[PDB]
């Protein structure tokens, strides 16, 4: 009844999930988020939220994800945006084998750029952490697009390591950018938080404390510049605090961005891989999880719905009505569903009239080893040692981030017994 084909999802950003959907008219991929209007309260009005929605609309700038449409029914905001293909921007930095100050300056630049652009034109992000740095594409040249910014002043419904004290107390303007974007800027320096733990609240306790510090040996060879740039944007008085602007125009980035010798980052590099690549395993592990409760909720559903579809209670179902009990699932267009159970049919499978108990486990198993070659992504690119091995302490990182040895086996076992548990 619209436009735009859903094609999968893409992840989640605030406020709702991000869609990948086909626009039907030209062909073109879209990033689509839908608002579901249940989960928000509004803090503002209509008018000063379609105001916000139009300055987004106009954003145009080389580092700023570009809002083709917005549009609304009963149930949803629907925010039309480009698609970025490029990864994010860590997932990229730790396939490196060097990385200088002069790369870090390059990167921040264009961080900046987009940070000063927002803030000019009242746009405040709020939440601003890597994931959020998208690579527009694989390009060589590929630009870093901020993503994710804006409606904070007109909704309301890991990433502690970013946000400004002042957002924790809930008194903020745009200031809380710059301070995100100068633990972006440590990071890419030593290669690991300036404000750390083990958990969120630990996280937390740190930042709102603001102490940190620039330890030996990783602070010892990075310039002078950038430390003072560093101390700058981590103010924690955010009216002392620099603007973005003045960062942008900040001598580090004036004399790194002019040109890797007096000033490697391959300590930081390292550390950097071992953050990011934990970062992404405890994800991976949190979404498998995820993953595992929705498919034991959906099973139970689905066979809710094909019991009642089942009016002999013969405990079996025709094409015809498998794709009913489908559909009534979605409910808790029709083109799309055909195409899905039919491809589940092949294994299920000739009669026409099957067992849908069978159809249930099918499908969702299909759900389950989908799961699994997901996380197993993430644990590759965390073993970076040859064992193949997650240990206790490395495993004590993710669990307790989440909620004397173990393999790739082992580690899946444990995570879906904790669903039973
Ligand atoms: C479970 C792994 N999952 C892949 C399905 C997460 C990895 N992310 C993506 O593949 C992805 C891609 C290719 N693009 C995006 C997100 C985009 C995107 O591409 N454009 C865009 C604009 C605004 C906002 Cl808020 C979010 C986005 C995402 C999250
Ligand atoms: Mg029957």
């Not at 626009?23 to 062909?27: A, C, E, F």
């Not at 290669?191 to 300036?194: E, L, R």
């Not at 073993?383 to 193949?388: A, F, H, T």
């Given at each position: 009844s619209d436009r735009y084909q859903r094609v999968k999802k893409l992840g989640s950003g605030a406020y709702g999930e991000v869609l990948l959907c086909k626009?039907?008219?030209?062909?073109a991929e879209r990033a689509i988020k839908i608002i579901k209007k249940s989960s928000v309260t509004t803090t503002s009005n209509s008018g000063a939220l379609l105001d916000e929605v139009a300055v987004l609309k106009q954003l145009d700038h080389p580092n700023i994800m570009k809002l083709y449409e917005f549009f609304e029914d009963k149930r949803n905001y629907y925010l039309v945006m480009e698609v970025y293909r490029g990864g994010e921007l860590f997932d990229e930095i730790i396939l490196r084998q060097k990385f200088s100050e002069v790369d870090a300056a390059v990167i921040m630049k264009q961080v900046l750029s987009g940070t000063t652009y927002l803030h000019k034109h009242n746009?405040?992000?709020?939440?601003?952490?890597?994931?959020?740095?998208?690579?527009?594409?694989?390009?060589?040249?590929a630009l870093i697009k901020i993503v994710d910014f804006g409606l904070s002043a007109h909704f309301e419904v890991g990433t502690?390591?970013?946000?400004?004290?002042?957002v924790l107390r809930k008194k903020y303007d745009e200031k809380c950018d710059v301070w995100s974007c100068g633990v972006i800027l440590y990071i890419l320096l030593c290669?690991?938080?300036?404000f750390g733990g083990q958990t969120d609240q630990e996280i937390l306790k740190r930042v709102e404390k603001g102490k940190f510090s620039f330890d030996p040996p990783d602070w010892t060879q990075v310039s002078d510049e950038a430390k003072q740039l560093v101390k700058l944007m981590l103010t924690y008085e955010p009216s002392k605090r620099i603007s973005a602007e003045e960062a942008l125009n900040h001598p580090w980035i004036v004399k790194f961005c002019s040109q890797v010798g007096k000033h490697a980052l391959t300590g930081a590099l390292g550390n950097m891989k071992k953050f990011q690549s934990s970062q992404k395993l405890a994800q991976a592990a949190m979404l498998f999880m995820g993953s595992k409760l929705t498919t034991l909720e959906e099973t139970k559903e689905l066979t809710q719905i094909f019991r009642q579809l089942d009016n002999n209670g013969d405990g079996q179902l025709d094409r015809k009505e498998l794709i009913e009990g489908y559909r009534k699932l979605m409910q808790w267009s029709s083109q799309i569903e055909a195409e899905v159970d039919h491809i589940l049919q092949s294994?299920?499978?000739?009669?026409?009239?099957?067992?849908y108990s069978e159809f249930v486990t099918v499908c969702m198993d299909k759900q389950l080893l989908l799961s699994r070659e997901r996380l197993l992504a993430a644990f590759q690119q965390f073993?970076?040692?040859?064992?193949?091995k997650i240990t206790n302490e490395e495993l004590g990182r993710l669990f307790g981030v989440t909620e004397g040895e173990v393999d790739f086996e082992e580690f899946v076992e444990m995570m879906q017994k904790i669903c039973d548990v």
């Open positions: 626009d039907k008219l030209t062909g746009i405040v992000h709020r939440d601003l952490k890597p994931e959020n740095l998208l690579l527009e594409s694989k390009s060589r040249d502690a390591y970013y946000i400004a004290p002042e290669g690991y938080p300036p294994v299920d499978f000739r009669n026409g009239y099957i067992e073993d970076s040692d040859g064992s193949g």
